[PDB]
Amino acid sequence: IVGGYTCGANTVPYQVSLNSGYHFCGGSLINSQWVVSAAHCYKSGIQVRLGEDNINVVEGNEQFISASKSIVHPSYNSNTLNNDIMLIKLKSAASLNSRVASISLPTSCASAGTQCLISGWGNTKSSGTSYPDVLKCLKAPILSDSSCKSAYPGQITSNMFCAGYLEGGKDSCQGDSGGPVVCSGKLQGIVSWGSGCAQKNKPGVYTKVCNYVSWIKQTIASN
Numbered sequence: 182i183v184g185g186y187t188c189g190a191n192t193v194p195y196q197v198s199l200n201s202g203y204h205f206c207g208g209s210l211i212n213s214q215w216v217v218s219a220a221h222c223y224k225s226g227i228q229v230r231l232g233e234d235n236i237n238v239v240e241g242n243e244q245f246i247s248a249s250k251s252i253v254h255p256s257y258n259s260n261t262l263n264n265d266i267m268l269i270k271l272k273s274a275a276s277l278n279s280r281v282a283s284i285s286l287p288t289s290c291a292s293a294g295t296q297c298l299i300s301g302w303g304n305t306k307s308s309g310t311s312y313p314d315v316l317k318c319l320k321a322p323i324l325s326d327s328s329c330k331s332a333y334p335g336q337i338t339s340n341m342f343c344a345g346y347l348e349g350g351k352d353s354c355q356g357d358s359g360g361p362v363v364c365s366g367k368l369q370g371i372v373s374w375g376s377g378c379a380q381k382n383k384p385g386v387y388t389k390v391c392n393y394v395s396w397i398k399q400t401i402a403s404n
């Protein structure tokens with residue numbers, strides 16, 4: 182997260198860290214056994230780390246659970262990143278409490294101007310790499326579809342939306358992929374891509390979760 186602030190320990194209880202010997206992507210806990218992340222974060226050997234604040238120190242509240250299976254959306258296109266969503270089923274259910282809790286899926290899509298909270302352990306530099314130990318937060322609004330398409334002509338599908346600041350300076354970045362975009366207590370987006378990080382007129386692009394609620398429910402119901 183570039184231009185964000187320290188969230189504060191366990192103030193984002195649905196945030197998870199996907200780990201393979203190091204933190205490589207974020208995710209959101211949606212129930213005690215399932216996590217939603219981005220398809221481009223897929224790899225084998227994933228350990229899901231819940232209740233984290235400092236990812237380099239065991240401070241208490243952490244729950245490390247292996248993923249039993251990862252389900253990348255069948256229509257995921259790695260070239261366009263269209264349908265960049267994946268579901269991860271945990272080997273055992275997580276113990277939910279105040280520090281580890283699930284986030285609700287939306288019942289409707291959000292409008293432009295909605296303010297959302299984006300969090301993660303991704304790079305904090307737009308020009309260089311600096312990875313933080315604790316979780317960073319950023320409040321960002323959803324932009325209009327016209328501003329988004331104007332910024333990324335020909336690259337935005339109906340399953341994506343832009344959120345951020347056209348002036349640059351505040352944005353999600355590499356390492357934040359797969360993490361949550363929460364607006365009014367509902368998971369509306371998944372950190373997906375962007376051109377560089379926090380560049381002027383190049384806002385972040387997110388997977389539009391409201392387009393996938395039935396798919397998520399049907400897939401969880403059959404696995």
Ligand SMILES: NC(=[NH2+])c1ccc2[nH]c(-c3cc([C@@H](CC(=O)[O-])C(=O)[O-])cc(Br)c3[O-])nc2c1
Nearest residue numbers: 353354355356358373374375376377378385386
């Ligand atoms: N500007 C943003 N809002 C943004 C958001 C998520 C991103 N995720 C990534 C991302 C980038 C890589 C690098 C690979 C590298 O430099 O080593 C790449 O360009 O392909 C890899 C992953 Br996986 C990302 O999620 N860039 C991102 C940029």
Ligand SMILES: [Ca+2]
Nearest residue numbers: 235236238239
């Ligand atoms: Ca820790």
Ligand SMILES: [Cl-]
Nearest residue numbers: 330334335336
């Ligand atoms: Cl277009």
